[PDB]
Amino acid sequence: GSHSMRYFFTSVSRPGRGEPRFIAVGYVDDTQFVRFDSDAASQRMEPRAPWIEQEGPEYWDGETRKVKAHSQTHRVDLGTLRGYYNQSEAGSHTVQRMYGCDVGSDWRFLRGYHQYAYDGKDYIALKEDLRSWTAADMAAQTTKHKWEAAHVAEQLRAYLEGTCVEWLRRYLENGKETLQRTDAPKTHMTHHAATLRCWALSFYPAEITLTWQRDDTELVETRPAGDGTFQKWAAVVVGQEQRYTCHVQHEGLPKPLTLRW
Amino acid sequence: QVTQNPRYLITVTGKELTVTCSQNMNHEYMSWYRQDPGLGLRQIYYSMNVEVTDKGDVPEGYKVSRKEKRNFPLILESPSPNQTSLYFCASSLIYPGELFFGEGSRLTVLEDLKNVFPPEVAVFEPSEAEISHTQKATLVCLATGFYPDHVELSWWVNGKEVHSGVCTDPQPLKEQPALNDSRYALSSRLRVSATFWQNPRNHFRCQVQFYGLSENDEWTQDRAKPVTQIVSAEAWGRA
Amino acid sequence: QLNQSPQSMFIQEGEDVSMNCTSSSIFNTWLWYKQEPGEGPVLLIALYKAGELTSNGRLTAQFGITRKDSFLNISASIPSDVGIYFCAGPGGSSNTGKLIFGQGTTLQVKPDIQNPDPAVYQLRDSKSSDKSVCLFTDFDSQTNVSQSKDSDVYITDKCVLDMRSMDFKSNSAVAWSNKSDFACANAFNNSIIPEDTFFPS
């Protein structure tokens, strides 16, 4: 299928005392495998997936020394932005980072991502192409030059389509059972009070869409189970009750199931 | 500008050193390099922004630290003859960028200071033969027996520096054969007007600066102590 | 490692010159630095995409589309450009913050001499003692100087000087001796030198 690798971050100002916190977890096609939390008691990289385990010891600290330096940077960032903001410094502000890259069923590089944000709205980003960035406002805007006179932006290009992907198949190769199989969702449907929804069961990966149709509809964000599987249901309003048909399809399934009953 | 402390000094096997370099302004990524005739430049340790400890290619015999921006020190728990080189401290605000290198701090590590000897200088007056066949003047000042290469020579016309018509040997030519363990040597030439020479009223001083020990180090041999010192030699015109 | 060539090069006033880098890893940034002895490295040209960069120069710097080697020419050589030249490539595929520099090729530039009427002259000390020197100067730029081959002696290699007031050039080479007493009219006979005016006292 189509696979990928990502690393999510979140750093947050805390003026009072405070706690400039920093979580770090990464995802292989929406599978947890990494961990770096400051308020914790390890100050390292902890395993979370039963396949991260194998790499050597200096891999792990080959990785703690970095999320370490990721963290200390957003100390500056968090305390740099306000320079735009002229804000209070008795306020808890938030910065999230986001860089990554994907690869088709080719196993060869495809697209590449790199975006920052603050307040939960877009700050700066890196387009499809790796020449050039995305400016949101004038604050996010200033940053650009020193990513545009120093060229630091320029390199990520060496790493994303180069270093990143080989890491991904370093991961995928020995990730075979718990990273790259197709979980077929099982289905049921129910009726009460009338209201009809047809549920989908225990499916990987994340993205599915189910829907109904012609012979005012409630549904829900995907829910994680904890088994590395997922959830969704589709509240649709209908007495006579043969009604509509649920359109269920995702890669796991041979082709879209139809069952009105 | 980045200032490099100190610009040139000597030590012994076993005594630690601390070479600090200043910074302005509010740059973030600085490293220390090593160079010597041969392999040329290489990188030792570096650290992007603050408190990020990163090794790099030639480490052993070194270590480093930095908890705030302005200063950046490379310390050495055991100076050994391998680390006798010429260290540089370059600077820029982010990774990567164009670097702003420093003056040029060189540390020379010795097994024993018995062989720390100062330069001896004498000037050599221009022949009339030269003036007779070309009508020009060439004075030649020297340094016979010093170690190691921690010298810089100049010339001084009528009490002040000059540079017009002066050359120096770009390398301390050894004397004795055993490689890499003995007193070097160095020469220059100051070339000026033929009439200029014949005047018995001008300054011709060959001033040479030898860097060395400083009197916070004990002395063994009852020979005088090398230290830091200027060794000048001067001559006058004769028609 | 980041390679570089040639070992060291010796062109003349007027000629062209060509150097090159070759890396092992893939770089997208190629920087040429130059240091003249005693000072820090200084940036000359930087390259970002494949294709050329004419600037500053005089100069011309190329980005090999391999993304794995680059080139630097210099047209119409000038003695003002003597120095140690480098290629900096901030790796990179290394996934580190390293800034990798090469071996560094040492350039040196012999300028011509307008009218080289070569000879060897003799000079004596301000200490007024029987220790001597015999300067060899004003000879063609091609001329090289060997080294004794005599235990006592130490032969300087060449030199170039300039009194800018008359636009006058002079190559220069020296060699001294005391013990045992030994004349200057036979301290240079080893090396190859066209005919000169060693004037008898």
Binding site: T73, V76, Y99, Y171 | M48, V52, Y95 | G97
Partner: peptide, 9 residues
């Protein structure tokens, strides 16, 4: 497999 380097906003 992460960024071996980091830049400051």
């Amino acid at each position: 497999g992460i960024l071996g380097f980091v830049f400051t906003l």
